[PDB]
Curated annotation (Swiss-Prot), chains A, B:
The gene is BRDT. It is linked to Spermatogenic failure 21: An infertility disorder caused by spermatogenesis defects and characterized by acephalic spermatozoa in the semen of affected individuals. SPGF21 inheritance is autosomal recessive. Interacts with mRNA splicing machinery proteins SRSF2, DDX5, HNRNPK and TARDBP. Interacts with the acetylated N-terminus of histone H1, H2, H3 and H4. Interacts with P-TEFb components CDK9 and CCNT1/cyclin-T1. Interacts with SMARCE1. Interacts with the acetylated N-terminus of histone H1.4, H2A, H2B, H3 and H4. The chain holds residues 29 to 134 of 947 of the full protein. It is found in: Nucleus. Belongs to the BET family. Bromo domains mediate interaction with histones that have acetylated lysine residues at specific positions. Bromo domain 1 mediates binding with histone H4 acetylated at 'Lys-5' and 'Lys-8' (H4K5ac and H4K8ac, respectively). The bromo domains also recognize and bind a subset of butyrylated histones: able to bind histone H4 butyrylated at 'Lys-8' (H4K8ac), while it is not able to bind H4 butyrylated at 'Lys-5' (H4K5ac). Testis-specific chromatin protein that specifically binds histone H4 acetylated at 'Lys-5' and 'Lys-8' (H4K5ac and H4K8ac, respectively) and plays a key role in spermatogenesis. Required in late pachytene spermatocytes: plays a role in meiotic and post-meiotic cells by binding to acetylated histones at the promoter of specific meiotic and post-meiotic genes, facilitating their activation at the appropriate time. In the post-meiotic phase of spermatogenesis, binds to hyperacetylated histones and participates in their general removal from DNA. Ubiquitinated in a SPOP-dependent manner, leading to proteasomal degradation. This is Bromodomain testis-specific protein. The record marks N81, D86 as: Histone H4K5ac binding.
Length: 106, 106
């Protein structure tokens, strides 16, 4: 659980502190945010909080499973949205930061 | 050139060999493939061949710059398309294979 501890103590915490992660800290509320077909279009929803619980509850067996989840969160946003959307710009900054943290992993 | 040697000799070559990389081995030809607004929508196009040239011509100073190009090629497909599209399924398999290779970089 060494790389997993990195993902939890370093990667996640660092991403969490940035305000551009705020829309990603909870599953998408399709009603409150008026995204009526969100769950019709996205089949594998993912958010940071789900990722955090999975780390807390020892859900992951290997670090690749966690990294898949992050990847799914970003691509989900790209799929659902289009270039130029605010949320996409936010997703892009999170992802960049993510990849930078990952390159430092043991 | 160490990590950049891995990206060229291991990562690029392994991805190139899969038929699902065929659509990404040349810049999108918007006319022949009848994607009229591709270049209107996508502001930063990227493909394997461009990445390959950049490695050959010693364009990247650093591993992060080349990894950034791969990420752009993936997100570009996601942004331009939508869930369930063939090209998207392809991008996803490419990206997954990409991530596994990355995890084995020095
Ligand atoms: C911290 C407040 C919050 C909670 N949910 N949420 C959402 N949910 C939609 C969503 C989230 C993640 C990925 N995808 O695809 C859709 C969007 C959003 N914002 C949209 C973009 C510009 C900032 C901003 C506006 C309103 O706070 N802010 C929030
Ligand atoms: C290997 C032949 C080829 C060359 N270009 N191209 C494209 N260009 C569009 C494109 C590429 C990369 C990212 N984005 O966003 C759009 C698509 C495509 N296909 C689409 C999906 C299922 C396979 C297949 C069908 C017809 O060969 N095949 C090809
Ligand atoms: Cl999209």
């Amino acid at each position: 659980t060494n790389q997993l501890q990195y993902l939890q103590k370093v990667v996640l915490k660092d991403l969490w502190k940035h305000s551009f992660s705020w829309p990603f800290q909870r599953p998408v509320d399709a009603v409150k945010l008026q995204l009526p077909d969100y769950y019709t279009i996205i089949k594998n929803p993912m958010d940071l909080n789900t990722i955090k619980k999975r780390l807390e509850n020892k859900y992951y067996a290997k670090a690749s499973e966690c990294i898949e989840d992050f990847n799914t969160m970003f691509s989900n946003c790209y799929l659902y949205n289009k270039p130029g959307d605010d949320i996409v710009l936010m997703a892009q900054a999170l992802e960049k930061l993510f990849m930078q943290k990952l390159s430092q992993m043991p």
